Design a protein around this ligand. Sequence first.
Ligand SMILES: CC(C)c1cc(C(=O)N2CC[C@H](n3cc(Br)cn3)C2)[nH]n1
Ligand code: NI
Ligand SMILES: [Zn+2]
Ligand SMILES: [Zn+2]
Length: 577
Amino acid sequence: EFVPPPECPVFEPSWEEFTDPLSFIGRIRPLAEKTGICKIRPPKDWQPPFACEVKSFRFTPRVQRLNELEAMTRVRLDFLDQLAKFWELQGSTLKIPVVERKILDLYALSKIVASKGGFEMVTKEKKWSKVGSRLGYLPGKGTGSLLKSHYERILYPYELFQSGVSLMGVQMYTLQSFGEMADNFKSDYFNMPVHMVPTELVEKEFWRLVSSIEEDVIVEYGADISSKDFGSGFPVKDGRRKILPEEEEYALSGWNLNNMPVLEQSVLAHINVDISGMKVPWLYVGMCFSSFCWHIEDHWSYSINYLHWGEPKTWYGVPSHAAEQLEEVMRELAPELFESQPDLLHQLVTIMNPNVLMEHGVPVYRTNQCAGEFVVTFPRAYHSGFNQGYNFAEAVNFCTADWLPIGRQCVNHYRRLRRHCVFSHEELIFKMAADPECLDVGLAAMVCKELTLMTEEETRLRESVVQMGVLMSEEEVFELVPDDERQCSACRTTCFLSALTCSCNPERLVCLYHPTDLCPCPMQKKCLRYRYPLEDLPSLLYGVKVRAQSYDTWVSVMLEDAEDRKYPENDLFRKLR
Ligand SMILES: CC(C)c1cc(C(=O)N2CC[C@H](n3cc(Br)cn3)C2)[nH]n1
Ligand code: NI
Ligand SMILES: [Zn+2]
Ligand SMILES: [Zn+2]
């Protein structure tokens, strides 16, 4: 019944193309960009050895019930819809909390609390830990009594309202053993050897199972697994190990996902300035039917995903230019609700059958990722998928010159939601501007383009605030204050260039796009806490415009200055030799 979408392009580079990954990825960009995702087959000789011992690799499995795997079911949405309207009536604007790294499933929570007699029943029986169990929350971190606090604050009043009339007060595992599991499950399921069931058939059954209430099917996986803690699946030189000479090659390869963030063309390659969460790969142990939902990368960045070993991983991809279109159809499922909670759209995990997106006009492509192949994801390319079988994968994010203006647009969009920021885009650009040499020429060029656009937009914001009637101008070093303190009262964007403070609160901030929402205290007194006194315009645009317009002229001892300034060498250095 399920209709496979068209396949995304594969790329089989030569050994020479394969030597500089990010340059090879900029070559295929104009083409792969249009499918959102794409597959990459390294030379068949290229076979890095798996660094990890499977027999002693202990991970805690998470679990998936493909029936309740879709969160945007009619019932859950209408519940949140009504619950929001309830809190509007009371004049208090539903605020959905976060528990153990992800949003609280209130619908599930009220269903369960109600199924065992309601809030006070569950309290006077102390079954709040059982609740958090059935909600999948990992014990015994105390979540039981954390839910009670939330239920009471948010759901008990609705429980009463929804209840009778009832309102008067108050208010305001081993990798080894895991393979045994997986292979046994798959064979018992299809009554075949695992390596013998065809891909197309698993694909058909998966999407069946998502919408089937007629039967329940549970599955286990592993994720939220840092290389930092568990170790990378690649060899790397960090003192943990003598690296064998058989491996030396692969420890240095730019396709080793531990080296990608640091390559000369990566944005983070020199900013030893902030833990961005992704300079460090993540591991994904997979099982038949294990799945990941539709998502885009934080700050709309690239993802690259290597399947170390195992059975294939199925993907689905959507080009960036269809991203606004993709979100639009998901929003159709509860427009009123997503009005009040714009970012709730992304917080809510979904596997929308690709067919559905296609019959709504959304381009969708697909591929089977096989052991030893890469998958690349392009900025704002939604993607999802499921595993054909037991396998093991490793992934990073990364950012390139061509991403810088997308990153800037992404903050503008996070700002127009109420979405936190993993880092300050503007800070990133200055940290790059503050080391113009040894900075890939492309970036430099792009930085200038991007930095001038910000000097403008800032000075506009800087001049607009003096009319409003602020006088004093303190000067602060934002990068040295923790993110959570330099965020905006209501944006909530990490401020770096400039923000507004007043004396009502010792430290409660607002970005310059929202200067009214700081505090009723009139603008009469200060304060525009800034970072540079508009004496940056000459300085920093210079160092970059230097290395930007030094390469412009150099092309128009010459082969020496390119070696000193660390220039690139594809067609231009070729003509040298
Ligand atoms: C960690 C950061 C860099 C990341 C991961 C992904 C990603 O999309 N995938 C999908 C396939 C694989 N996978 C995840 C689960 Br859960 C199961 N398989 C990794 N994108 N960025
Ligand atoms: Ni991803
Ligand atoms: Zn004040
Ligand atoms: Zn703001």
